[PDB]
């Protein structure tokens, strides 16, 4: 009735991808960790946009939606920041938001590409993943775009703009031993990247005593958070949800008894 002792083996570690294997844990635990990668990892993104001038061929909400999807480097100050709901200040403050300024006007005949590089943050650390550049809008001569934007702290449950990761690869039981999927013709299915069987055989022999374990992960960051920090933040957030639920359950038990 006690906790399994999971182990981690990290195979690939880049600035964009972390490929790791978690052993000796439940399938539900692994899937919840995967869901938190997408849903419950806090990340800073633009949520409040106010436009002073927009002469571009894209309307105001178009460019606002494009701005909100621009990832911002939230590696360390995301934990320091507080949700605007939990912040004591009205509107926005530096302890709950990062302000952005955009001012682009096309004066030359050549087309003007408004990029994330033209986003200017009041913080030196929260940068739109520009150490190419994400295109915001193209400006013909005589077209102008000036706006102010505030970046809030949020997670992917509220909006996909706060999804810190690209496609999270998840896999368990590479050679089909638990038969959680049944192949009508196993011979015509490509072998997994983590398959451990020979070319001659298609799937592993059925294991009645087996259970899902050794879950293969490949979390691809979108640049807002380092891909290793995504897993750390996910584990911390899942543990925080469990701890809050435990506190409220303890209060409920004491009150009802």
């Amino acid at each position: 009735p006690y906790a399994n002792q999971p182990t981690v083996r990290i195979t690939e570690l880049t600035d964009e991808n972390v490929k790791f294997i978690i052993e000796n844990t439940d399938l539900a635990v692994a899937n919840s960790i995967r869901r938190v990668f997408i849903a419950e990892v806090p990340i800073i993104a633009i949520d409040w946009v106010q436009i002073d001038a927009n002469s571009s061929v894209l309307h105001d909400e178009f460019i606002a939606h494009r701005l909100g999807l621009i990832p911002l480097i939230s590696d360390d100050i995301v934990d320091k920041l507080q949700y605007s709901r939990d912040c004591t200040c009205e509107e926005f403050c530096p302890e709950c938001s990062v302000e952005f300024t955009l001012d682009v006007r096309c004066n030359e005949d050549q087309t003007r590409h408004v990029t994330s590089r033209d986003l200017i943050s009041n913080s030196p650390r929260v940068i739109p993943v520009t150490s190419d550049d994400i295109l915001i809008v193209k400006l013909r001569k005589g077209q102008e775009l000036r706006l102010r934007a505030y970046a809030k702290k949020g997670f992917g449950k509220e909006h996909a703009k706060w999804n810190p990761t690209a496609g999270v690869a998840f896999e368990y039981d590479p050679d089909n031993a638990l038969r959680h999927t049944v192949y009508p013709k196993p011979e015509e299915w490509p072998k997994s990247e983590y398959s451990e069987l020979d070319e001659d055989e298609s799937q592993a022999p059925y294991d009645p005593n087996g259970k899902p374990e050794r879950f293969y992960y490949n979390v691809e960051s979108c640049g807002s958070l380092r891909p290793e920090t995504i897993v750390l933040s996910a584990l911390s957030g899942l543990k925080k949800k469990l701890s809050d639920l435990q506190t409220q359950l303890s209060h409920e038990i004491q009150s009802d008894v």
């Binding site: 621009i70 013909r140 496609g167 979108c222």
Partner: protein, 67 residues
């Protein structure tokens, strides 16, 4: 209209890869090779640039309301 950020399915940044894709197509590369050069592996990401039609370039042929 314009190259979308954040590929619909997975969420990879593809808004910074349209001009590079156009250049790779213009110089040597085929579309499949150009997509690989940009690191667009998942076909959800590949269809973002492969099926993109850049109408904003046609929209820039119209004079602005204010000179």
């Amino acid at each position: 209209m314009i190259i979308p950020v954040r590929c619909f399915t997975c969420g990879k940044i593809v808004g910074n890869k349209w001009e590079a894709y156009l250049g790779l197509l213009q110089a040597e590369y085929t579309e499949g090779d150009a997509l690989d050069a940009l690191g667009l592996k998942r076909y959800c990401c590949r269809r973002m640039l492969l099926a993109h039609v850049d109408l904003i370039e046609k929209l820039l042929n119209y004079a602005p309301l204010e000179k």
